[PDB]
């Protein structure tokens, strides 16, 4: 059980514009050993890991609300087909390491480019 993330998605043809709006994360792990975590996310492309944004980070909080948005330019149709976009939940941590809390992978030829997806999307284990 690792959360459920909300996010939006709005693909513009003529632009080669991506945009993505992270809106909110609820039910997430408490990560340290005092049951908090400070979440925040990491939206990237593969396989082109070139461009990726971080939302702000949300201090000890299970049910961070971002309403964030970032748009990925330059991503013609005939390329952004056989991408899948990544959204990667960490818990911040200023000294180590970033410990990831999960992910939610979205393989762009297996949606709908031509309407605004919005969805909840449950976590999957991180990596490693």
Same mark, same amino acid.
Do not use: C, H
């Given at each position: 059980k690792l959360g459920k993330l909300q996010y939006? /998605?709005?693909y513009d043809f003529?632009?080669? =514009?991506l945009t993505v709006n992270v809106i909110q994360a609820a039910d997430l792990p408490g /990560?340290?050993?005092?049951?908090?975590?400070?979440?925040?996310?990491?939206v990237y492309l593969m396989p082109d890991k070139k461009k990726k944004f971080e939302t702000k980070v949300h201090r000890k909080t299970l049910n961070p609300v971002f309403? =964030?948005? @970032?748009?990925f330019k330059n991503v013609p149709y005939a390329d952004i087909t056989g991408k899948t976009l990544i959204f990667?939940?960490?818990?911040?941590?200023? @000294?180590?390491k970033h410990d990831q809390i999960g992910q939610v992978q979205v393989p762009m030829n297996s949606i709908d480019l031509g309407s605004v997806i919005e969805e909840?999307?449950?976590?999957?284990?991180?990596?490693n």
């Open positions: 939006s /998605m709005d003529q632009k080669g =514009e /990560m340290d050993m005092s049951g908090t975590s400070d979440p925040y996310v990491k309403n =964030e948005s @970032f748009t990667a939940i960490y818990d911040f941590d200023r @000294f180590s909840w999307r449950d976590l999957t284990s991180p990596d």
